[PDB]
Design a protein around this ligand. Structure first.
Ligand SMILES: Nc1cc(O)cc(-c2nc(N3CCOCC3)c3oc4ncccc4c3n2)c1
Lengths: 277, 991
């Protein structure tokens, strides 16, 4: 049954797709995941088997000579389907003992048939229009949240440095209390016995003014502390909203791409695809 | 702003004055007033207040205050304006200055250029940071000694380096423009008392050194003046700060070479050697005040404990589980299988589990990294999303293996990245501590554990062998085939085993090293050891190919060492200037602060001021970015401390740009709901001020330091139509010979758009033009100046006499007819030629790079007929994701309007001999760039860590592989191009 099927009908056979398309189907997939594509025309070989191993994509060339296929001399397989089905049951250690695994999970080109079983072209196209509109909408919703996010992050930066600049100011104005304390200790002493209260009247006036000025500054950074706590909170909230859109975005993109694939594998005009999108 | 909160301070402003006797005095001041008048105003009123008797003379005291950057700053320059003081709050503390004044002034001047206070580096606990600051100084002072090998000619070569090409050899079509290989050159001389010029037209060989140009000039005792007064004068470009100081063939200088192709006469200027030599600052250098088991002995598999995360910002409603994803990486490829923690609730992020990796600790390569992220989850179809990420070097800068508990504050996921891990991102904890914090534990192996020394490695590499043949022609041919693959064409497992088996023959074809390195099993100390011995004695390679080895796929220090050593030997200042953007960005991949590449670039920047200029600006533009803040800041600090007098010139540029940022900010926030008429009035009223005039005049163009920007033509400066409000600025060229080059310099200042994509597009265009020119294809492009100077802040050079296509059109014949008026008579053919050549270059270039769709506003034309493009915005088809189709756009479609011009107004505009002649130009241009595909792939690969959404992954760079048809044969590649043009032009391609 299996060995007699055409390579053309093989689920793991994708034909003329590029190495970059292969990468996007193999990203974050378990070891044993595989697919076959045509080899690049400027090279020896006919097909490239690609499989997951230790988190990497391994490329193995399939060569042909006189009706036989294989990875190296000698070529012993009668067809590519025969070759692949052999290594779905046997470990690749038989070929190379360093890459010890089996071809376990095929990337089927009848993948989208599971998600979309809708047989009508126009029904699939119209659902492509619905999934695309949803995706574009959420993309722009996420985009605005990112603008908000970055702006919020930048304004928090300004406030944090302003807090440190307030603290520095308070230090200077507090050291100014130290200097006035160390300077007046003997100058109030001289006129405590001389009874000159008129001078004390304007020295204490200056000192009270200094204390009065500190209050405002401490209060101003106290107000900035509250603003910052409020804006940091906004930041975390924007971040929460973004983390909810992300999963929905990937799913909406994945569904659109698979619905685009179904119409492509049915060969719908490149112009009618753009009227839906 | 110039004050905190308020963008612009009011004319009158009260200042609190803190006196040394503990008194506070309020003083009435002006926003323009200086510190000398404030201090004299203060002590005038301080006589009223108590304890004045204790106050000393004004000459004994100085003003101190806190700045916007939270730094306590003492103001020595007492002739500074109040608005220019950069005060956090309107208060001044007067105290007596103590300590080294000289280095305090210098520290604040570095700090100002650098964007951050230098004392923020003093309070960094991290030893690697302080080691970099001290050890890099050795490079700095070692660099100032090359600046004194032949003083004061060394000083001149540094400040005004020869702006030359890479090769003295001229292409055919350049030489064919010369009269029998000779160039007519005009030398001007001054008689300043009379202050007028006398021109001397000369006709000498193109390959004449400035001395042969200086010898002939005097003629226009016969040989006596060229015997004594030969090396007594120097040549200068008219209307430029560009000098000819070194023995190079005249035609090798960019200006002269530019004159030939343009058809313009070279206007040089005779000037006394001593006149510039004494004008030079002669800047000196001062040292600042801040001047056990082996890894292969550990019999244990790797394991890391994930303890807990402080918090994640996630809605409990929407997400089911959170977990930690982990990987052991060498560059962008995993060394073993990724390992996840068990899934946990969002509310409580706690794991406390030892994760086990399929790697024996001895097998950990020197550049091994831990890549991690907190991910969220949502038959059982489920989506995985990264919440935050972080990378850790498994070895520190002193080759020490990490151990015990450590905390890693994570980073926000870059826009557009969907990958669960970010192996390309920088390593180290987020400087921002108010941030998701992963706590982890590494094993502790009863020691400081160190990576083996090179000698130990060599012994093992010999041992691995101990556990004759020739190279057949068959093998020799496959080796050539493998080496011709582009840097993104993955090699097969048969090819890996082939290359490795033949690693001893691979030396015969040195350019195959990138492929042999991909064939190495990096999770095997046996193979890495054998690679090291081969790398050490490896033949040096072409710089363009060595740069391949500097992207994020080659993290190993020996490999990178090799690459840098190639650049040290073979990279000329010309090509270094051309690739500087990539060489700077590639510093982001470097594991550590101290590395051979950073020592190379800094040395080059400190021995060549043209490189120094752009080195500073590329680094500075990204100082807002917290991923690179510390690294670039530290790098900038070193440069600014050792560059000498140029720091004063850079300061004026920074001071000018900040004030333009200030003005555009106000326009975008506070004046948004105002009309352009009033917005412009605000601009003028604010520019007319003395502090703005002194800042925005008499500084050097950051687009080109040879261009001095003199007085503003304020009546001609305008805000542009866009919402980001670009400023169309206009400066006088203050050169005493400016009329011969350009009298006025126009620049567009943009604040709101990321100009890094355009900056790269214009670099690529310049390189493409260079390729075509040297290969005999005269396709003139116009890669105008464009420089990113900060976060979405940049400068764009204005091309004189250029009009958009819509301007011409506002009938499909009016473009051709317009060009006819501007080029009337027989000079008409030179215009149609230039248009056709321009059109071809831009048609091919835009297709390859997939830049945003062109329209009447995107496309511009000069008077002479040269066509060029502006506002590229997005490349590599960034409109393909968010859209469906996986096809390749043709951004620049030739409408009948363009086809008429090429056909000179013929009926069958697609069936003329001129159109097919144009077609072959596009075919030649296309294949020319394809043959240099590696260079462009390499340049892009260095840009993946840059932060540009348009290239975040190798999948994005895959676009040029598809437009250049690299997986195809050269015949098929041409056929692919033809079909794309035919489909775009609706068959009107006469195939
Ligand atoms: N975001 C961006 C990026 C860029 O590389 C170039 C420009 C740009 N550059 C120009 N230049 C570049 C050099 O030639 C002269 C003006 C422009 O002229 C315009 N006129 C009318 C409307 C818009 C423009 C315009 N835009 C804008």
């Amino acid at each position: 049954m299996n060995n007699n099927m055409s390579l053309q009908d093989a689920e793991w056979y994708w034909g003329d797709i590029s190495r970059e398309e292969v990468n996007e189907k193999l990203r974050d997939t378990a070891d044993g995941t595989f697919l076959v594509r045509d080899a690049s025309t400027k090279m020896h070989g006919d097909y490239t088997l690609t499989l997951r191993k230790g988190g990497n994509n391994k490329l193995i060339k399939i060569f042909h000579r006189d009706g036989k296929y294989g990875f190296s001399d000698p070529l012993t397989f009668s067809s590519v389907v025969e070759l692949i089905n052999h290594y779905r049951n046997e470990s690749l250690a038989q070929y190379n003992p360093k890459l010890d695994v089996k071809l376990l999970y095929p990337v089927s080109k009848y993948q989208q048939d599971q998600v979309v079983k809708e047989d009508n072209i126009e029904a699939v196209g119209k659902k492509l229009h619905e999934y695309n509109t949803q995706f574009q909408e959420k993309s722009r919703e996420y985009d605005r949240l990112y603008e908000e996010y970055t702006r919020t992050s930048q304004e928090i930066q300004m406030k944090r440095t302003a807090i440190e600049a307030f603290n520095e100011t308070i230090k200077i104005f507090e050291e100014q209390c130290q200097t006035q304390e160390r300077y007046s200790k003997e100058y109030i002493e001289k006129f405590k016995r001389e009874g000159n209260e008129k001078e004390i009247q304007r020295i204490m006036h200056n000192y009270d003014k200094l204390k009065s000025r500190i209050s405002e500054i401490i209060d101003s950074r106290r107000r900035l502390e509250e603003d910052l706590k409020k804006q940091a909170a906004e930041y975390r909230e924007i971040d929460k909203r973004m983390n909810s859109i992300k999963p929905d975005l990937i799913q909406l993109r994945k569904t659109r791409d698979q619905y685009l694939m179904w119409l492509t594998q049915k060969g719908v005009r490149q112009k009618k695809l753009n009227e839906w999108l | 702003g110039e004050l905190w909160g308020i963008h612009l301070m009011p004319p009158r402003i009260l200042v609190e004055c803190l006196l040394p006797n503990g008194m506070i005095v309020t003083l009435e001041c002006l926003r323009e007033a200086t510190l000398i008048t404030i201090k004299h105003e203060l002590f005038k009123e301080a006589r009223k207040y108590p304890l004045h008797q204790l106050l000393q003379d004004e000459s004994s005291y100085i003003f101190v205050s806190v700045t916007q950057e939270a730094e306590r700053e003492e103001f020595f320059d007492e002739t500074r304006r109040l608005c220019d003081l950069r005060l956090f709050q309107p208060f001044l503390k007067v105290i007596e200055p103590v300590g080294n004044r000289e280095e305090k002034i210098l520290n604040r001047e570095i700090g100002f250029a650098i964007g951050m206070p230098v004392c923020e580096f003093d309070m960094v606990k991290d030893p690697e940071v302080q080691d970099f600051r001290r050890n890099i100084l050795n490079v700095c002072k070692e660099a100032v000694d090359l600046r004194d090998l032949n003083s004061p000619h060394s000083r001149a070569m540094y400040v005004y380096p020869p702006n030359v090409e890479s090769s003295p050899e001229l292409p055919k079509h350049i030489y064919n423009k010369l009269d029998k290989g000779q160039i007519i050159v005009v030398i001007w001389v001054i008689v300043s008392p009379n202050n007028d010029k006398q021109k001397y037209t000369l006709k000498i060989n193109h390959d004449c050194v400035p001395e042969q140009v200086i010898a002939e000039a005097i003629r226009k005792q016969l040989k006596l003046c060229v015997l004594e007064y030969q090396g007594k004068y120097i040549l200068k470009v008219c209307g430029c700060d560009e000098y000819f100081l070194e023995k190079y063939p005249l035609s090798q200088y960019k200006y002269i070479r530019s004159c030939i192709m343009l058809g313009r006469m070279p206007n040089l200027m005779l000037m006394a050697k001593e006149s510039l030599y004494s004008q030079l600052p002669m800047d000196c250098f001062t040292m600042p005040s801040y001047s056990t088991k082996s890894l292969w002995v550990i019999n244990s598999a790797l394991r890391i404990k994930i303890l807990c995360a402080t918090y994640v910002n996630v809605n409990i409603r929407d997400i089911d589980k959170i977990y930690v994803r982990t990987g052991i990486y060498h560059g962008g490829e995993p060394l073993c299988d990724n390992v996840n923690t068990q899934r946990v609730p969002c509310s409580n992020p706690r794991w406390n589990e030892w994760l086990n990796y399929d790697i024996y600790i001895p097998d950990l390569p020197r550049a091994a990294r831990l890549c991690l992220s907190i991910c969220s989850v949502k038959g059982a179809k489920e989506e995985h999303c990264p919440l935050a990420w972080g990378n850790i070097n498994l070895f520190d800068y002193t080759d020490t293996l990490v151990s015990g508990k450590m905390a890693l504050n994570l980073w926000p996921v870059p826009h557009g990245l969907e990958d669960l891990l970010n192996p390309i991102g920088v390593t180290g904890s987020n400087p921002n501590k108010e941030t998701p914090c992963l706590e982890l534990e590494f094993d502790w192996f009863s020691s400081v554990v160190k990576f083996p020394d090179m000698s130990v490695i060599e012994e093992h590499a010999n041992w691995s062998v101990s556990r004759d043949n020739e190279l057949r022609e068959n093998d020799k041919e496959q080796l050539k085939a493998i080496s011709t693959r582009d840097p993104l064409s993955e090699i097969t497992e048969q090819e890996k085993d082939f290359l490795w088996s033949h690693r001893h023959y691979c030396v015969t074809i040195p350019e195959i090293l990138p492929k042999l390195l991909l064939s190495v099993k990096w999770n095997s100390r046996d193979e890495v050891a054998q690679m090291y011995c081969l790398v050490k004695d490896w033949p040096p390679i072409k710089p363009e190919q060595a740069m391949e080895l500097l992207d994020c796929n080659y993290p190993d220090p020996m490999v990178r060492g090799f690459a840098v050593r190639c650049l040290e030997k073979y990279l000329t200042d010309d090509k270094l200037s051309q690739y500087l953007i990539q060489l700077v960005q590639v510093l982001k991949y470097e594991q550590y602060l101290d590395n051979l590449l950073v020592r190379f670039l800094l040395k080059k920047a400190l021995t060549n001021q043209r490189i120094g200029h752009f080195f500073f600006w590329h680094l500075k533009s990204e100082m807002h970015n917290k991923t690179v803040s510390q690294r670039f800041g530290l790098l900038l600090e070193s440069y600014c401390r050792a560059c000498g007098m140029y720091l004063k010139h850079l300061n004026r540029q920074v001071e000018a740009m900040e004030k333009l940022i200030n003005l555009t900010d106000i326009l975008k926030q506070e004046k948004k709901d105002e009309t352009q008429k009033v917005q412009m009035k605000f601009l003028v009223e604010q520019m007319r001020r003395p502090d703005f005039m002194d800042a925005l005049q008499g500084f050097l163009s950051p687009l080109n330091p040879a261009h001095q920007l003199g007085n503003l033509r304020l009546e001609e400066c305008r805000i542009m139509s866009s919402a980001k409000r670009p400023l169309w600025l206009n400066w006088e060229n203050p050169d005493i010979m400016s009329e011969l080059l350009f009298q006025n310099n126009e620049i567009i200042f943009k604040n709101g758009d990321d100009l890094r994509q355009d900056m790269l597009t214009l670099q690529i265009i310049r390189i493409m033009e260079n390729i075509w020119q040297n290969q005999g294809l005269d396709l003139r492009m116009l890669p105008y100046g464009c420089l990113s100077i900060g976060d979405c802040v940049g400068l764009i050079e204005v091309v004189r006499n250029s009009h958009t296509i819509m301007q011409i059109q506002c009938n499909s014949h009016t473009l051709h007819q317009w060009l006819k008026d501007k080029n009337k008579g027989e000079i008409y053919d030179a215009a149609i030629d230039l248009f056709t050549r321009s059109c071809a270059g831009y048609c091919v270039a835009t297709f390859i790079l997939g830049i945003g769709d062109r329209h009447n506003s995107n496309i511009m034309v000069k008077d002479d007929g040269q066509l060029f493009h502006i506002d590229f915005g997005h490349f590599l088809d960034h409109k393909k994701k968010k859209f469906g189709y996986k096809r390749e756009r043709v951004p620049f479609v030739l409408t009948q309007d363009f086809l008429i011009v090429i056909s000179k107004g013929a009926q069958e505009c697609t069936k003329t001999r001129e159109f097919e002649r144009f077609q072959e130009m596009c075919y030649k241009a296309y294949l020319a760039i394809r043959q240099h595909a590696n260079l462009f792939i390499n340049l892009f690969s260095m840009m993946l860590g840059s932060g540009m959404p348009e290239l975040q992954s190798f999948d994005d760079i895959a676009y040029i592989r598809k437009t250049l048809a690299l997986d195809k044969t050269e015949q098929e590649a041409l056929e692919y191009f033809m079909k794309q043009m035919n489909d775009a032009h609706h068959g009107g391609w006469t195939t």
